[PDB]
Symmetry: D2
Subunit: 268 residues, 4 copies
């Protein structure tokens, strides 16, 4: 009946029911989309979580650092959606920085191999997902990735912030490639969301000083946001992703849509 | 029934059938919205224009420089949508800069009285409109204004560019006020569109040389834009406005959505 | 002996010994510059304040809203520096917003005539100072204005923030005109400084809620600044202005240099 | 005696007499600085290069990918400037991206190992250099790196542009660490300069067509720049670096100074 009626959309990045991708998928399905899901390592976990979505969607394995997974992805998706059908959307909702690159650990103490792995997964992979799927996307199509505003430095997020600055740069280059297919590429810069990992972090999993810093950042965020911000509700974020997946933002690419309560637009 | 269904939306700024506001209004009605229009000094001319829209809408006089028009706006809007009803959306599609402030004269030769009038109409009035209408707006509502990207300077647009810089600033403050009513405020930064105001502005003039320069703007922007840009078609811009009038961008406020083909994201 | 040896520089905007222009002038003089000073209305005040600078400098009257003052400025300066000599620098250190446009008074309650006067003095005047003086500036010359970062909205500063967004846009256009003379135009975005007016404001001159808000902003500023920020010391700001007035930033124009402790580069 | 007098400054990144670092070093010595140089793998080649500088400087081996070189850097620098002496300045003038990541190959065809190496050398190493040298830097000291503006995407520069995006992010975090020693950290975003790395990069290639494209970059940037731009002359860039090494920008950190003729501030 709705926003994404008849669109075929791949959604990556579901790990638990609190993953922002889980909510992107739920809202996408409620809006009439047919999904193909992608998951990384804990596939039995992902299967039982994904089984709680509004409707069943095939689940495909994808480790973004695995060249063979990427090489086979388009065939695997085409098998899953039916030959002669293509994708109208791709959601990249994936990120990771080793523990040395976030929290307590001194900014200067992250080894490059840790940083490099974080940038592989968190940035480069946006270009490799695009490289793999563009050949099977329809004109009018939409690639969307998850971002957080890295224009300013901050405590705790450290090398993950750097990875996001790279990711934003990648998005602008992907947009040049995607545009040849009549496909758009954009990021959604969310406000902070209480995933399992972020709850653990605030709980002090990466040191308590880091937990305390993120707690302040979260409180300040809701204060700054002219419409407020609820870090326990990824729905407004999922809806924004769907807006980009729809045809109602046909002239936007290489860009960033801030789904953050308007916090980034206010000093205080 | 097709995005804005059940929504009551005020749309200002129709002067010709080429007006961006005209297309905003057309697309909005196609998508199920009940409109109230607002117009200038040629209420006859714009009434003949307005009747060529999909369905019928009250048409209302608003001189934004007329503090009387503004003091009675909420009064006249409520009479026309019916008591006990509020607005869900407000579109500011109003610009003006005297020719002295635009491609003719040297930048330095515009008298402040001319600039001050342009800033009044182009930027201040966004806050005036918000002041007048916020009190009869529903929670979850949306105010949108038309912008163009003034982050870098450029030939000809001169003091109108300055007025867009002021407008973007005015927008972030409006969002603080609007947020108290649960209402969002955003700008759409459009790529260039061949409205009658644009064709006339510049080209003519500066220079004199060209409507060729107009055509040249068209060809260079299409190239800059990863997904291309059709200056003759403001439908993509009108869709972007309608996305912001909808509930699909519920967490974005004080912000600017670029409906410019992605040109702003590319150096070339 | 030093940075600005043999340069002739006009400095506007001295009102008291706590004016940021007073410190710009002091540091400029200590660095070997010959000044011409400009003052607005309280010339006897300005005379006795200016008499405390390291060396004597002629003082000229300039009301930036007075067309006759601007029309005569270049002749008056040339009389003061000697015919056949030109300026190597111009410092615009001037700003003002009526009380309705800052503090307690609702953002929406500032009348346009108040706003317009603030933008006249705070923004447009940067272009009119440039229009008046460029004809008497040497190649390699430098125009510098005072800014504060208005990229985000904030409590209290209200319409003055809007005026600064306009001022930044003006600077980019002035740079296009100045470049024809081989002159640069740049702004320095300072951190908050305790002038008389800002002390009075924090003391509650514009309402106590506004005072309290600015006090927080000041405290947060020093916290965010990786090198700290001392709001009672305009010297680091004056030095930055002199850097721009020197030949050590020969390839920078239409731009903004942040003399703010690095605060704008940090979220927290 | 002419800006940097008495200052001890480390300068990395000399490979040819056309290197930006070479001109930084020349100008810095002209302005009274005692230099320590740092070099690659052609220490013979760069020693013959280095001797053509104004005065004599220790030359030191630094492979930034060599965690051993980095662990002994502060050791080897102190031996060479003398015990009980510290550095006042550090210049990072290092870039690398394999050709696969630059105008040759399609953006998507660069393998991550190549990108990861480029990011290592171009962006991560700014933090590595800071980690190694901060401990022997004086209060009031200054770290500067070379950047180019990566806010918008563009032909050819591809993953090197991504690496500059990462670098600007890395810079704001370095400034948080540097601030503890009373040390500033900033980037100079230069306009394009006809170094041997640039001429070769692209032009050749892509395309093949042209060193004409090189010349075209030159002519278009000069036009974009309000004060013009001479791609054959890196003196203006070297002066800007030296301004940041001086005490005349004492309140700026985590920031980017644009020494690009002001091109970045103009749409065209
Ligand atoms: C406070 C100042 C900075 C701040 C930070 C934030 C945020 O960090 C926000 C803003 C953006 N995000 C982004 O959403 C995305 C989804 O994460 P998110 O949903 O937040 O976390 P998770 O649920 O745990 O999902 C991470 C997924 O990743 C997958 N992953 C891991 N490695 C693999 C490889 N090798 N292959 C394929 N997939 C990979 C893993 O399996 C998970 O499914 C991600 O890009 C986040 O960075 C997540 C937010 C958060 N609060 O959880 C917003 C505003 N500001
Ligand atoms: C080339 C680089 C420069 C730059 C410029 C542009 C543009 O200028 C785009 C970007 C934004 N716009 C905006 O849309 C809006 C509508 O424009 P547009 O629809 O193009 O012009 P108009 O049709 O003539 O609409 C202006 C309206 O205003 C109203 N108005 C005027 N004064 C009075 C007052 N005193 N009383 C009440 N009404 C009045 C007037 O009556 C008109 O109805 C406006 O804000 C524009 O500035 C219109 C553009 C265009 N190409 O037509 C995009 C990208 N880059
Ligand atoms: C906290 C978030 C926002 C925030 C705000 C701030 C600031 O407001 C900063 C940053 C920039 N400034 C700017 O410096 C400039 C100097 O002011 P400043 O020196 O701060 O104030 P004053 O000493 O009182 O000087 C104002 C002058 O103006 C003159 N004036 C008044 N009308 C006339 C006309 N008609 N003609 C000619 N001259 C005019 C008047 O005579 C005074 O000499 C000014 O542009 C300020 O806006 C002054 C700061 C301050 N803290 O005093 C920085 C960082 N962030
Ligand atoms: C046209 C739009 C694109 C864009 C690009 C540009 C530029 O690329 C400008 C802007 C910035 N730069 C930067 O200066 C710096 C020096 O460049 P540049 O001096 O141009 O190149 P090089 O002379 O060849 O210097 C690179 C040095 O690095 C060193 N290096 C390399 N790897 C090794 C490791 N493993 N060991 C130790 N040393 C090594 C290498 O030995 C060289 O000494 C660098 O960061 C550049 O990216 C140099 C530019 C230029 N035109 O030459 C400006 C505006 N716009």
């Amino acid at each position: 009946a709705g926003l994404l009626e008849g669109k075929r959309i791949l959604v990556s990045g579901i790990i638990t029911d609190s993953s922002i991708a889980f909510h992107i998928a739920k809202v996408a399905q409620e809006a009439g989309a047919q999904l193909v899901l992608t998951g990384f390592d804990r596939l039995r976990l992902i299967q039982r979580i994904a089984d709680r979505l509004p409707d069943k969607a095939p689940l495909i394995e994808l480790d973004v650092q695995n060249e063979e997974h990427l090489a086979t992805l388009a065939e695997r998706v085409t098998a899953e959606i039916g030959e002669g059908n293509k994708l109208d959307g791709v959601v990249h909702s994936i990120g990771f920085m080793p523990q040395t690159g976030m929290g307590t650990n001194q900014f200067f103490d992250a080894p490059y191999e840790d940083v490099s792995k974080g940038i592989h997964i968190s940035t480069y992979s946006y270009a490799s997902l695009a490289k793999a799927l563009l050949l099977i996307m329809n004109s009018g199509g939409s690639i969307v990735g998850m971002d957080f505003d890295p224009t300013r430095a901050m405590p705790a997020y450290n090398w993950m912030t750097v990875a996001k600055s790279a990711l934003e740069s990648v998005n602008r280059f992907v947009a040049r490639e995607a545009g040849k297919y009549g496909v758009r590429s954009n990021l959604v810069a969310a406000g902070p969301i209480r995933t399992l990992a972020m709850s653990a972090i605030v709980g002090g999993a990466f040191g308590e000083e880091a937990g305390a810093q993120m707690q302040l950042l979260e409180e300040g965020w809701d204060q700054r946001a002219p419409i407020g911000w609820n870090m326990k509700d990824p729905t407004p974020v999922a809806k924004t992703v769907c807006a980009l997946l729809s045809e109602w933002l046909p002239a936007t690419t290489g860009s960033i849509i801030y789904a953050d309560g308007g916090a980034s637009t206010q000093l205080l």
